[PDB]
Amino acid sequence: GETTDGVYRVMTRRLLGSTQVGVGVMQEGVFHTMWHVTKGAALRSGEGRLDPYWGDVKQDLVSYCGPWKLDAAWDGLSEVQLLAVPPGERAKNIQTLPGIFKTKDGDIGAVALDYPAGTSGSPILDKCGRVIGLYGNGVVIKNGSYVSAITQGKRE
Amino acid sequence: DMYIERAGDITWEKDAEVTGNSPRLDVALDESGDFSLVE
Ligand SMILES: O=C(Nc1ccc2c(c1)CNC2)c1cc(F)cc2[nH]ncc12
């Protein structure tokens, strides 16, 4: 149905009324979201249908209609923008300087902005406008707030 | 059944609200894609 490049809301009519479950990026005819939002289930776009193509629970990523297309990366120095799309609220660019998630397999960028779980899948952008990762997978810190990793896939 | 609706364009906005800190945290990622803090 709607294949225009841009940011989209992921909704469901299974609960009370229409409930936003997450967010995702349409780019090059591919819908990119976080796995925990759809669980790999098929999506609807008006009268059309989006079937999953690639998915991975550990990476917590999933693509629809084709392979992952997002390949930009955080440079480790520059500030970034979280294009937060919160439930029932308009899309909004929040600029921040990310922290680091230090792991046994390497370091990852991390946005320390707190948002409802339904914001999951919101793109994190660089100054060029390129999607460098997705918001929605991180941790709950000492003060109860959420710090999300900058989760990026691999382009083949 | 899940469905999608367009929410906007993907553009960098100049003079956007600048908030948030940059913390360095020790984390672990399990086979279920879940992060946890290490201390
Ligand atoms: O719960 C959240 N994220 C999540 C859920 C389920 C799973 C994963 C991540 C990866 N493995 C399965 C969440 C996301 C968010 F954007 C803001 C939040 N504030 N408190 C919580 C969350």
Side-chain angles (χ1 to χ4, degrees):
Chain A
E2 184 172 24
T3 353
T4 302
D5 256 50
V7 53
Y8 288 72
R9 299 183 190 269
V10 185
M11 309 286 298
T12 186
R13 296 215 184 86
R14 199 185 61 97
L15 276 60
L16 191 77
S18 308
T19 299
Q20 175 166 313
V21 287
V23 172
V25 178
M26 188 72 65
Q27 190 180 105
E28 302 161 55
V30 176
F31 191 68
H32 311 73
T33 191
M34 307 218 82
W35 194 85
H36 75 257
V37 167
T38 75
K39 309 297 180 180
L43 305 170
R44 178 171 58 84
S45 177
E47 222 171 356
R49 181 185 178 135
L50 314 179
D51 299 309
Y53 178 111
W54 168 79
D56 194 300
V57 162
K58 202 167 176 234
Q59 293 190 46
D60 189 31
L61 290 174
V62 64
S63 73
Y64 284 79
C65 303
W68 193 265
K69 306 266 171 157
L70 316 174
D71 56 346
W74 181 49
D75 64 350
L77 302 185
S78 317
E79 288 205 319
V80 309
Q81 245 160 43
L82 164 61
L83 177 33
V85 177
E89 293 169 6
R90 189 154 59 246
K92 180 186 52 188
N93 289 62
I94 306 297
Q95 192 170 308
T96 191
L97 183 89
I100 312 295
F101 259 17
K102 287 157 150 163
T103 86
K104 75 199 213 288
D105 293 312
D107 297 354
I108 307 161
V111 286
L113 306 161
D114 186 285
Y115 277 96
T119 317
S120 299
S122 279
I124 304 166
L125 325 171
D126 68 6
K127 312 202 201 178
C128 263
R130 300 174 296 158
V131 184
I132 60 169
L134 296 186
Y135 172 91
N137 200 20
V139 87
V140 170
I141 48 179
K142 312 148 64 94
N143 32 269
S145 180
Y146 207 73
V147 169
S148 165
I150 307 177
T151 307
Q152 183 60 301
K154 201 211 165 185
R155 185 183 175 111
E156 298 264 23
Chain B
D1 211 325
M2 286 171 193
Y3 66 98
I4 72 167
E5 299 178 326
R6 208 176 186 270
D9 284 9
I10 286 152
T11 59
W12 173 266
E13 173 193 2
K14 264 201 166 200
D15 299 323
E17 192 225 337
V18 191
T19 184
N21 64 317
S22 329
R24 284 178 213 262
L25 301 168
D26 281 334
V27 304
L29 178 68
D30 71 17
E31 215 195 80
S32 309
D34 291 333
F35 289 106
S36 55
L37 283 172
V38 172
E39 296 277 332

